[PDB]
Ligand binder design. Structure first.
Ligand SMILES: [Ca+2]
Ligand SMILES: [Ca+2]
Length: 123
C-alpha cells in the first residue's frame, strides 16, 4: 500500500519526505506519467509505474480490492535494508517487490530539484 511504500523510502533515505519529495517530479514521479524520463530518478518512477500496471493485471490480484495503492503487505526495514515477507500472498509479494525495487532505485540516483513541477510540454 502507498503508506507502506512511504515507509520503504524512509528506510532507504531517512532524510527524505516521500509524499513531498517524490511527487510532481519529472514526467513520471506522481500520479500518472508518460513520455521520456528526464533523468534517472524519473526512470525509477517510470519502472515503478509499469510495475503497478502489471500488478493490476496480475491474475493473483483481485479486481479493485487488491490494487497497489491500498493493498497492505508485510515488509521489514533492517539497517536501511528492505525485506518483503514470505508471509505475503502472490499478489502482495509482487506489489511489495514493486515498491522495494523503487525504494532502492530512488536511493541510488541523484535528486535534481530543477526537475520538479515540469510542464507536460517537456515530456
Ligand atoms: Ca507515475
Ligand atoms: Ca493485503
Amino acid at each position: 500500500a502507498l503508506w507502506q511504500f512511504n515507509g520503504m523510502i524512509k528506510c532507504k533515505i531517512p532524510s527524505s519526505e516521500p509524499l513531498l519529495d517524490f511527487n510532481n517530479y519529472g514526467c513520471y514521479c506522481g500520479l500518472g506519467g508518460s513520455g521520456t524520463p528526464v533523468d534517472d530518478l524519473d526512470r525509477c518512477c517510470q519502472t515503478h509505474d509499469n510495475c503497478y500496471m502489471q500488478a493490476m493485471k496480475l491474475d493473483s490480484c483481485k479486481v479493485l480490492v487488491d490494487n497497489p495503492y491500498t493493498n497492505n503487505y508485510s515488509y521489514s526495514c533492517s539497517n536501511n535494508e528492505i525485506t518483503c515477507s514470505s508471509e505475503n500472498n502472490a499478489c502482495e509479494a509482487f506489489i511489495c517487490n514493486c515498491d522495494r525495487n523503487a525504494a532502492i532505485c530512488f536511493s541510488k540516483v541523484p535528486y535534481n530539484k530543477e526537475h520538479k513541477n515540469l510542464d507536460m510540454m517537456n515530456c
